[PDB]
Design a protein around this ligand. Structure first.
Ligand SMILES: *[C@@H]1O[C@H](CO)[C@@H](O)[C@H](O)[C@H]1NC(C)=O
Ligand SMILES: *[C@@H]1O[C@H](CO)[C@@H](O)[C@H](O)[C@H]1NC(C)=O
Ligand SMILES: *[C@@H]1O[C@H](CO)[C@@H](O)[C@H](O)[C@H]1NC(C)=O
Ligand SMILES: *[C@@H]1O[C@H](CO)[C@@H](O)[C@H](O)[C@H]1NC(C)=O
Ligand SMILES: *[C@@H]1O[C@H](CO)[C@@H](O)[C@H](O)[C@H]1NC(C)=O
Ligand SMILES: *[C@@H]1O[C@H](CO)[C@@H](O)[C@H](O)[C@H]1NC(C)=O
Ligand SMILES: *[C@@H]1O[C@H](CO)[C@@H](O)[C@H](O)[C@H]1NC(C)=O
Ligand SMILES: [C-]#N
Ligand SMILES: [C-]#N
Length: 398
């Protein structure tokens, strides 16, 4: 099933539009995914598009190897949504060949280690999808090997990463199309195995559908919708009411739930009935499209768990975010609450506390909780309230 925002309700998407526009004044965040979504729905913003190229050119010279596989995949997608002059940058800077190397690097690490890539299956899926859409050299055999639905990298503890599964589905579907078309060769029987993978992932995705229509959570719904658009083969119209989902999302938007330019960007395409598979490197650009009118305090229970728990009383200004709490709590005692952050596009990401750094290969990270409950937002975004047990917990995957 595919449902779209009624053109009568197109105005409801205004906050996302604005939110993504304000991204301009932020060299910290990425403009790639922002421009990616916009271009994908036939909307062009010069100011953001200019910012995108700036970052892209800045990263081809230096950082070239520091850019992650998925990040490169995203760059490739944003430049090649439709055919324009900027698409040449894909074939000028050998980005596809670069992605093949970065993707292979992910593979190497999975063998050099217990099955963990340099990043994650979400990015891995992005890689395969990009390589697939742009005729890159990838092993369809290696795809079947590493993408089985029961793979550990689809799950975080007990939670099945809806985001990951959704992106996996999109990628796998692309290969599925690239196989039916003579666009690439594959060991016969692979199509079946891929379809089966896809079938399984969809059922898992739908299993995480909330009663209000959300799939996973708010910020996984956007791309879960895309995955479900392209996989009607594996579900009935009673297993999902798309219009309900669309309604719930529209409600949250009005509630400012997508103040995060990355959260906004990732939800935009599905709301307009678009998916990443709508990307055609051989032109579809609708250029003419686009036309736009224009002293309270609070206290919380700040826990930090490793084996033992170090908890304190923190009092901050109203409207303060989780990260601010962490910063004030680190002033109270640096030995116990001193931490390390990285900007990580999405916003501040907590890497180390007390010198204990998260390790990808060790499957370990710091989890953010509110009264023993995993947050749906990053530390910089999550506005804290009152009486909350704000726990930061050393965690693994099962
Ligand atoms: C498909 O899956 C079956 C069972 O897992 C396996 O025996 C076979 O090798 C796979 N076929 C291909 C072409 O990968
Ligand atoms: C555009 O928005 C402004 C906001 O002040 C409003 O005054 C005006 O009526 C709108 N015009 C059109 C054509 O939408
Ligand atoms: C604060 O958090 C810690 C860890 O969960 C807990 O031991 C303590 O009881 C909490 N205090 C309150 C006010 O609930
Ligand atoms: C906590 O305790 C475990 C086992 O008692 C120990 O191996 C580890 O170093 C400590 N911290 C963690 C969770 O790594
Ligand atoms: C922490 O102290 C603040 C004021 O310093 C107080 O409002 C709060 O009640 C204290 N914590 C608890 C357990 O109430
Ligand atoms: C601070 O403001 C928020 C919303 O503006 C409100 O929910 C909260 O009640 C205020 N502070 C307290 C302690 O109530
Ligand atoms: C930090 O907290 C610990 C634990 O109570 C305390 O012993 C120490 O004096 C505090 N000061 C620092 C910065 O180490
Ligand atoms: C993140 N899960
Ligand atoms: C998750 N970052």
């Amino acid at each position: 099933e595919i449902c779209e925002v009624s053109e009568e309700n197109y105005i409801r998407l205004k906050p996302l539009l604005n939110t993504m526009i304000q991204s301009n004044y932020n060299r910290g965040t990425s403009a790639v995914n922002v421009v990616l979504s916009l271009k994908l729905v036939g909307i062009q913003i010069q100011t953001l598009m200019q910012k995108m190229i700036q970052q892209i050119k800045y990263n081809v010279k230096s950082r070239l190897s520091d850019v992650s596989s998925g990040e490169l995949a995203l760059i490739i997608l944003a430049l090649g949504v439709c055919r324009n002059a900027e698409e040449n940058l894909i074939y000028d800077y050998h980005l596809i060949d670069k992605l093949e190397n970065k993707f292979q690097a992910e593979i190497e690490n999975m063998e050099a280690h217990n099955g963990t890539p340099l990043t994650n299956y979400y990015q891995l899926s992005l890689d395969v999808l990009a390589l697939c859409l742009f005729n890159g050299n990838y092993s369809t055999a290696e795809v079947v090997n590493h993408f089985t639905p029961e793979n550990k990298n689809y799950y975080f503890g007990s939670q099945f990463s809806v985001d990951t599964g959704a992106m996996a589905v999109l990628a796998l579907t692309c290969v599925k199309k690239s196989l039916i078309n003579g666009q690439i060769k594959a060991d016969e029987g692979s199509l079946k195995n891929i379809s089966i993978y896809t079938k399984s992932l969809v059922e898992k995705i739908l299993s995480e559908k909330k009663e209000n229509g959300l799939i996973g959570n708010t910020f996984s719904t956007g791309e879960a919708m895309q995955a479900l658009f392209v996989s009607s083969d594996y579900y009935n119209e009673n297993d999902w009411n798309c219009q309900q989902t669309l309604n719930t999302v529209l409600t949250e938007i009005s509630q400012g739930a997508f103040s995060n330019p990355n959260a906004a960007a990732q939800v935009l395409p599905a709301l307009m009935g678009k998916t990443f598979l709508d990307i055609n490197k051989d032109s579809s650009c609708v250029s003419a499209s686009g036309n736009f009118n224009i002293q309270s305090y609070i206290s919380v229970n700040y826990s930090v768990r490793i084996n033992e728990t170090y908890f304190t009383n923190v009092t901050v200004l109203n409207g303060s975010v989780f990260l601010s709490v962490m910063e004030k709590a680190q002033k109270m005692n640096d030995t116990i609450f001193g931490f390390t952050m990285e900007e990580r596009s999405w916003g501040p990401y907590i890497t180390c506390i007390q010198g204990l750094c998260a390790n990808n290969n060790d499957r370990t990270y710091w989890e953010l909780l509110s009264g023993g409950e995993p947050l749906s937002q990053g530390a910089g975004s999550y506005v804290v309230r009152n009486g909350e047990n704000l726990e930061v917990r050393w965690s693994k995957y099962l």
